[PDB]
Amino acid sequence: SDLIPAPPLSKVPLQQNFQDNQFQGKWYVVGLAGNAILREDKDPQKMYATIYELKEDKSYNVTSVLFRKKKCDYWIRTFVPGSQPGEFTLGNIKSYPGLTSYLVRVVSTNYNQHAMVFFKKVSQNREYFKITLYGRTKELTSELKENFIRFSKSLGLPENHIVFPVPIDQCID
Ligand SMILES: [Zr+4]
Numbered sequence: 001s002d003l004i005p006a007p008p009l010s011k012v013p014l015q016q017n018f019q020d021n022q023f024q025g026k027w028y029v030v031g032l033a034g035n036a037i038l039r040e041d042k043d044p045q046k047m048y049a050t051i052y053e054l055k056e057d058k059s060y061n062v063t064s065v066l067f068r069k070k071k072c073d074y075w076i077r078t079f080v081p082g083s084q085p086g087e088f089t090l091g092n093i094k095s096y097p098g099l100t101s102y103l104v105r106v107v108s109t110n111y112n113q114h115a116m117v118f119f120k121k122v123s124q125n126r127e128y129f130k131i132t133l134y135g136r137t138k139e140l141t142s143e144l145k146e147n148f149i150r151f152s153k154s155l156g157l158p159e160n161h162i163v164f165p166v167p168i169d170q171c172i173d
Contacts, residue, residue, distance in 0.1 A: 018086030027134035034130025
């Protein structure tokens with residue numbers, strides 16, 4: 001298919017003095033945007049959650065749970081600290097078939113309510129990016145939703161590649 005290009009990393013801020021210990025725990029995905037994300041009127045996008053647990057060596061074990069087809073689907077990732085704090089790369093990338101590049105950058109967070117994280121990957125030689133708006137709860141202020149929209153557009157995404165998943169209780173409590 002056709003894809004809105006990944007922006008240069010220069011357009012993607014890094015959270016200053018990132019605190020990896022304070023970033024741990026459960027985060028709800030309250031907003032989602034990217035070049036392979038489309039707004040779906042039929043079966044709209046359900047909220048999922050992602051738990052960041054800091055390992056002794058300072059990598060994250062990252063677990064996500066989605067409710068799908070009457071069950072909880074879990075997937076696990078290891079994020080390995082990169083060049084500066086708040087940048088990560090994917091651990092054990094050999095084990096993901098098709099996957100050649102995977103980069104995470106924490107754009108901003110106040111640690112105890114919200115965060116914005118940028119993801120870039122190359123899979124079957126196609127370049128995907130997305131941005132999650134994370135909340136420690138399932139709702140955030142309009143102000144932060146609008147800032148997430150402003151930022152997503154600044155990276156070239158139109159309105160219909162920006163989604164706000166509907167809150168649910170299954171799995172993610
Ligand atoms: Zr992924």
